[PDB]
Amino acid sequence: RRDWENPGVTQLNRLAAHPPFASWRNSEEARTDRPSQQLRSLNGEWRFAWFPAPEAVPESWLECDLPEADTVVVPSNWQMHGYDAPIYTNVTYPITVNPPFVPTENPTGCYSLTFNVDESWLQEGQTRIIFDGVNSAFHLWCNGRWVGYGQDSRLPSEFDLSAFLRAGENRLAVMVLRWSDGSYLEDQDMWRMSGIFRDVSLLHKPTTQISDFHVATRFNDDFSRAVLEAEVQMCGELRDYLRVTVSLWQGETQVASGTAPFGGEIIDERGGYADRVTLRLNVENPKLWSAEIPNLYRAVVELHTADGTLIEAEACDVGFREVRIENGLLLLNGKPLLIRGVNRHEHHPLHGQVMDEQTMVQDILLMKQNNFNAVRCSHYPNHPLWYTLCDRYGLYVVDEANIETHGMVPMNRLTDDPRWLPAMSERVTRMVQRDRNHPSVIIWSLGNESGHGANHDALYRWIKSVDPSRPVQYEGGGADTTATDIICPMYARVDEDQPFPAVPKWSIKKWLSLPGETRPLILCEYAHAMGNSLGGFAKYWQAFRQYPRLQGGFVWDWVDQSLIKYDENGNPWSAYGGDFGDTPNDAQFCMNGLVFADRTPHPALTEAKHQQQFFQFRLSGQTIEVTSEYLFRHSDNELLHWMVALDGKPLASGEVPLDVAPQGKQLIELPELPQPESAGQLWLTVRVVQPNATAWSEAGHISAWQQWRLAENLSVTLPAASHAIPHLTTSEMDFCIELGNKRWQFNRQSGFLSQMWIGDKKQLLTPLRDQFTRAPLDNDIGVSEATRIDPNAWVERWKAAGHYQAEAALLQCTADTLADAVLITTAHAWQHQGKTLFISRKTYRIDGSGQMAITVDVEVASDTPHPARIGLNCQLAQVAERVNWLGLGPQENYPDRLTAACFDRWDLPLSDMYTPYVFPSENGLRCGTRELNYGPHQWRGDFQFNISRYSQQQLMETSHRHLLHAEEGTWLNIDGFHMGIGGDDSWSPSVSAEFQLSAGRYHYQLVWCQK
């Protein structure tokens, strides 16, 4: 029948979808969500054999275990065990586009498991098996007998095993197909794996059972009163003595309880559902649920007899919250939301796509600690535990159907095809039937990148029909089609329009007011965090706050999809597309996260935390205006800590308790501040600290911060008169300056400071020369390849202009002696094939104080691509342990991504000045620095810089970070100016005009001396 090549057959003998069941036989246990004897786990060691195609599987395998098979762990992806290679492809399907057919060489995983079943389970009731996740299709045999078939890799497939099992030992045989017609609906930008990668369990239910139940909560005008409505459905034999009791608990305190026999109200001319019943419970002053305060209640559903005998119990956590769109705004419990969200794939560096509680909790904590309050299930229903955690920890979830047909041409070829409506409907309907009781889920999504087809409109309507409690969104077809209640574009920019044909990406501000538009706009994806990114992040947030209908978005995305491989000596390294022999592939585009695969933060995470703060501040005189962006909670676990410092020197600090109501304000006046001892700039820094621990944070957690320049006192006092005078020594080849223990050497042919001495030690490995380029960032590269060059990408424009091959032509080099110093003057012209790209004019003034003032003035041809930077560099001879500086820090920061950094005195080990992006590039920069100290060297001025053991050349020539090798000495890069990193997207120039080096003529000055 080749059921895996027919979208008309997505399952065989599969049981209906429903909310999480456990069939407790004790109510108290259901109330506490404790383990159930009726819900067993079959996770653990299984038998597994790999085959190249289903036709290669031996018939003996159904009856008897294969001796060639290995014992492996389940759940898991067999690619992670190395049976075959995992594939990373973005848009292009991993298989030939020829729906509904798949390759004949279809990797087949044969899993089997011998397990016990107690006679008590077979003597009464129904025993079903549940597969939470099987990629991508599979057939099922129990004791040699065929049971059923299933598709859709991201939702549970359940079958009734009652007629197949026997008391004692039993053997399951599961044949998993890597590819199937269902693969055409699973073209998400991520690794292509397969296997039984989610929990497998055994559930026993009484013959007469609770087959389904829906929990709803509607409120009155001010939410002071609510009604919990619970529709319960049963299967089995109807009897008058049967009853359904639904009780609601708030902790240990029972809040309400209701009981009733089956028999619903009249529905139509044929009557009503005799097998259903709706219980309604009133609740006064309910504790509302929100990401701010995740108050949860427990709903216990009991199926029993009128005499009081319990037959079975189910239950769920209930969160009293209302989600509705009104007058253009998405409201939660009547208040307009501000989505601080992120897209999150289920990815583990070692386990692939198998999730575990530990990892889920770790992601959630990091998210809430960094001011995220929402997550989007990109792009499929998640592991069931994920919704439980979000309910409890408090995160707004967008539940997304497992539907993506990005590779099709056009994108909606399948979604507009009625013969694919069935397969699509199951992926949407079975998702709703499974998660509709989770309060964390506030929005349903019809899928991702599948264009806009009629099937979308149909399913969009189906949801609005079955579940009115949640809005429905979908981005395909233009982000604003008839299949979405929310304008949810991906990578739409703040002010810049991208008028693509048929599916343009308008600036979000303009989008809201297009003629006739009135819906709220929340980007389903924005701020592509690939590599050194998130430049311009602060621009979205400024907009979200000013525009009521710009209600935020979900950053793309949470964690890099890098995998772990081992080298020749067992050393692990982060691998990406193509590193497994997988081809065609999309290399590093699988790494777009705010954190590395191991959950170690990327520098951009801190920018997100800052911009996403819940407290806004304003300064006026000595009064700080604190404004809360919370919608429901008072600042009951926050205190404001202020600190005034002069050029890094702490001059005064204090603490004030924060007592601000949601959306309210608090005025805090600072004490009379004492005038600073010397000259310099006074800086004010405030921080919001949570004194007490929470479920998601430790005591002392900093949730927000801000800075302001206070009084500045310009130094107007001339330094002491030098004692000695620098001596100049002109020679055919050099201009040497001597001053005590110091020696400066300027090569007259190159016109560069080729060397410096402090006593007997040389200070340079490579001369100090100008630099106008940088090792290409992922955003500089885009989709350009050696095979497919993108002339539009920044990297290509620089290469094409000769920026990386520019050779300096010495125009002038003269030496002059002053009354108290030696003045060296140079002028270089960088040219490429007769084109003068840049002209550098400098003057070095070495005085008796032993200081070398470097004054630089650059000219950049208006018709050459704006340069990546304008500074100097050199390979210092020394290698120190610490790096001390006065500027923006402590973490890496760039022009368009430095709002999170603060100005102060920072001190870090040299290694922290290097950001280990898997794909190497220019990194570690720190802007707005007035003083830098390394070893015996000190540079002063107003510049940005990066210092490490890796030269820009090595960084741009190396593909993986583990292949880098510390160079001799330390490479220093001091820039007077540096281009922005961009990041609105990573496949087209995204550096905003204000952050491009286009002034034409640049000036900057540095002073080098001993610390």
**Which residues here bind a copy of itself, judged by CB under 8 A?**
681, 709-714, 716, 718, 809, 811-812, 814, 816, 818-819, 823, 827, 829, 831, 836, 839, 857, 859, 861-863, 942, 1001, 1003, 1005
Q: Is 985 in the site for Mg ion (CB under 5 A)?
A: no
Closer residue to Mg ion (CB): 402 or 944 = 402
Kindly give, in sequence order, each residue whose CB lies less than 8 Å from that of residue 71, ignoring residues fewer than 6 positions away: 45, 46, 47, 48
Residue 457 interaction partner, one of Mg ion, a copy of itself, Na ion, none, beta carbon < 5-8 Å per kind:
none
CB of 327 to Na ion, least distance (A): 14
Contact 443, 471 (CB under 8 A): yes
Closer residue to Na ion (CB): 304 or 493 = 493
- Site size with Mg ion, rule: CB under 5 A: 6
> In 370-420, which residue ranges form alpha helices assigned H by DSSP?
385-393
Q: Find the part of the chain contacting Mg ion (CB under 5 A) among 178-186, 310-318, 888-896, 986-994.
A: 178-186
> How many Å apart are CA 396 and CA 572, to the nearest integer?
35
Q: Is 920 in the site for Na ion (CB under 5 A)?
A: yes
Q: How many CB atoms lie within 10 A of CB 502?
A: 8
Closer residue to a copy of itself (CB): 33 or 734 = 734
Tally: H helices and E strands in the chain: 13, 58
Closer residue to Na ion (CB): 188 or 826 = 188
Q: Is 568 exposed, middle or buried (0-12, 13-18, 19+ CB in 10 A)?
A: exposed
> How many Å apart are CA 649 and CA 677, to the nearest integer?
10
Phi and psi dihedrals of 522, rounded to 5? -135, 115
Closer residue to Na ion (CB): 211 or 562 = 562
CB of 423 to Mg ion, least distance (A): 7
Residue 863 interaction partner, one of a copy of itself, Na ion, Mg ion, none, beta carbon < 5-8 Å per kind:
a copy of itself
CB of 607 to a copy of itself, least distance (A): 21
- Binding residue for Mg ion (CB under 5 A) from 132, 158, 181, 985? 181
Closer residue to a copy of itself (CB): 502 or 718 = 718
For 510-515, the CB contacts below 8 A with 24+ separation are 511/480, 511/487, 512/487, 512/547, 512/549, 512/550
Residue 638 interaction partner, one of Na ion, Mg ion, a copy of itself, none, beta carbon < 5-8 Å per kind:
Na ion
> In 96-254, which residue ranges form alpha helices assigned H by DSSP?
119-123
Name the residue with tokens 């200081």: 851
Q: Is 189 in the site for Mg ion (CB under 5 A)?
A: yes
Contact flags string 401-440 toward Mg ion, x per CB under 5 A: -----x----------------------------------
CB of 785 to Na ion, least distance (A): 13
Q: How many CB atoms lie within 10 A of CB 492?
A: 29
Residue 449 interaction partner, one of a copy of itself, Mg ion, Na ion, none, beta carbon < 5-8 Å per kind:
Mg ion
Q: Is 589 in the site for Na ion (CB under 5 A)?
A: yes
Torsion of CA 30, 32, 34, 39, to 10 degrees: 20
Structure tokens at 754: 């080729």
Closer residue to Na ion (CB): 472 or 550 = 550
- Binding residue for Na ion (CB under 5 A) from 395, 658, 704, 900? 658
- Binding residue for Na ion (CB under 5 A) from 189, 449, 485, 922? 189
Residue 908 interaction partner, one of a copy of itself, Na ion, Mg ion, none, beta carbon < 5-8 Å per kind:
none
Contact flags string 349-388 toward Mg ion, x per CB under 5 A: ----------------------------------------
Phi and psi dihedrals of 625, rounded to 5? -100, 115
> How many Å apart are CA 76 and CA 88, to the nearest integer?
18
CB of 189 to Mg ion, least distance (A): 4
List the one residue out of 673, 694, 556, 554 whose CA is nearest residue 624. 673
- Binding residue for Na ion (CB under 5 A) from 356, 567, 807, 816? 356
Q: Find the part of the chain contacting Na ion (CB under 5 A) among 178-186, 274-282, 780-788, 948-956.
A: 948-956
CB of 710 to a copy of itself, least distance (A): 7
Closer residue to Na ion (CB): 198 or 828 = 198
> How many Å apart are CA 646 and CA 552, to the nearest integer?
37
- Site size with Na ion, rule: CB under 5 A: 12
Q: How many CB atoms lie within 10 A of CB 884?
A: 16
**Chain centroid to CA 939: how far?**
37
Residue 649 interaction partner, one of Na ion, a copy of itself, Mg ion, none, beta carbon < 5-8 Å per kind:
none
Contact 211, 233 (CB under 8 A): yes
Contact 431, 155 (CB under 8 A): yes
Closer residue to Mg ion (CB): 586 or 780 = 586
Residue 836 interaction partner, one of Na ion, a copy of itself, Mg ion, none, beta carbon < 5-8 Å per kind:
a copy of itself
> What is the amino acid identity at position 579?
D
CB-nearest residue to Mg ion? 406
Closer residue to a copy of itself (CB): 163 or 999 = 999
Residue 9 interaction partner, one of a copy of itself, Na ion, Mg ion, none, beta carbon < 5-8 Å per kind:
Mg ion
List the one residue out of 20, 23, 32 whose CA is nearest residue 302. 23
Closer residue to a copy of itself (CB): 518 or 812 = 812
Torsion of CA 565, 357, 378, 566, to 10 degrees: 0
Residue 161 interaction partner, one of Mg ion, a copy of itself, Na ion, none, beta carbon < 5-8 Å per kind:
none
> What is the amino acid identity at position 397?
V
Handedness of CA 486, 492, 496, 501 (dihedral sign): negative
> How many Å apart are CA 76 and CA 97, to the nearest integer?
27
Q: Is 592 in the site for Na ion (CB under 5 A)?
A: yes
Closer residue to a copy of itself (CB): 655 or 816 = 816
Name the residue with tokens 């001597």: 738
Q: Is 655 a catalytic residue?
A: no
Q: How many CB atoms lie within 10 A of CB 251?
A: 9
> How many Å apart are CA 749 and CA 770, to the nearest integer?
16
> How many Å apart are CA 602 and CA 600, to the nearest integer?
7
Residue 942 interaction partner, one of Na ion, a copy of itself, Mg ion, none, beta carbon < 5-8 Å per kind:
a copy of itself
Residue 28 interaction partner, one of Mg ion, a copy of itself, Na ion, none, beta carbon < 5-8 Å per kind:
none
Q: Is 922 a catalytic residue?
A: no
> How many Å apart are CA 278 and CA 260, to the nearest integer?
8
Q: Is 9 in the site for Mg ion (CB under 5 A)?
A: yes
Catalytic residue among 525, 796, 892, 922: 525
Catalytic residue among 426, 449, 475, 796: 449
Residues numbered 540-579 forming contacts with Na ion, rule: CB under 5 A: 544, 548, 550
Residue 811 interaction partner, one of a copy of itself, Na ion, Mg ion, none, beta carbon < 5-8 Å per kind:
a copy of itself
List the one residue out of 775, 809, 779, 737 whose CA is nearest residue 921. 775
> What is the amino acid identity at position 691?
P
> How many Å apart are CA 360 and CA 519, to the nearest integer?
33
Mind giving me the DSSP string for 192-229? E--EE-S-EEEEEE-SSEEEEEEEEEEE-TTSSEEEEE
Residue 861 interaction partner, one of Mg ion, Na ion, a copy of itself, none, beta carbon < 5-8 Å per kind:
a copy of itself
CB of 719 to a copy of itself, least distance (A): 11
Closer residue to a copy of itself (CB): 814 or 884 = 814
Residues numbered 625-654 forming contacts with Na ion, rule: CB under 5 A: 635, 638
> How many Å apart are CA 119 and CA 141, to the nearest integer?
20
What are the C-alpha distances in Å from 575 to residues 19, 343, 563? Answer: 38, 21, 5
Name the β-bridge partners of 676.
none
Q: Which residues bind Mg ion (CB under 5 A)?
A: 6, 9, 181, 189, 406, 449
Residues involved in catalysis: 449, 525
Binding footprint of Na ion on the chain (CB under 5 A): 189, 356, 544, 548, 550, 589, 592, 635, 638, 658, 920, 956
